[PDB]
Every structure is written in structure tokens, then in C-alpha cells.
């Protein structure tokens, strides 16, 4: 339930570098693929459930 956008899937760690103001992000198909940690600002990588 990061930042209100509740979803399901495997949370991993990516090598992406978000901007200091962008929190979440989509892909070509406009689907949430990576979000920031709420209390840590860590660049997480949400992947679809297997």
C-alpha cells in the first residue's frame, strides 16, 4: 500500500535513479513498475506476481 496505490506483486530492488520529486512511475503500457519507499525514499521495483 505504498503512497495509496494498493497493488500486488513481488517487491525487488532496481538500479533506477528517480528524480528528487518523482515518487512513483509507469512503463510503456502505463503500469506501475517502480515506486519510492515512503519512509526511506529507496528505489523499489514492483514486478507482477508470478
Amino acid at each position: 500500500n505504498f503512497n495509496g496505490l494498493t497493488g500486488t506483486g513481488v517487491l525487488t530492488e532496481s538500479n533506477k535513479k528517480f528524480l528528487p520529486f518523482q515518487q512513483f512511475g509507469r512503463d510503456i503500457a502505463d503500469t506501475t513498475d517502480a515506486v519510492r519507499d515512503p519512509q526511506t525514499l529507496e528505489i523499489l521495483d514492483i514486478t507482477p506476481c508470478s
Partner: peptide
């Protein structure tokens, strides 16, 4: 007076 804005004024969209 007036001036021409070639390519400016483009702000960032929602935080995506």
C-alpha cells in the same frame, strides 16, 4: 514590448 519564446515553459507533469 514583446518577445518570442522558441522552446521554453515546459514544466514536469505529474510525478511519474
Amino acid at each position: 514590448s514583446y518577445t518570442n519564446s522558441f522552446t521554453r515553459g515546459v514544466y514536469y507533469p505529474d510525478k511519474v
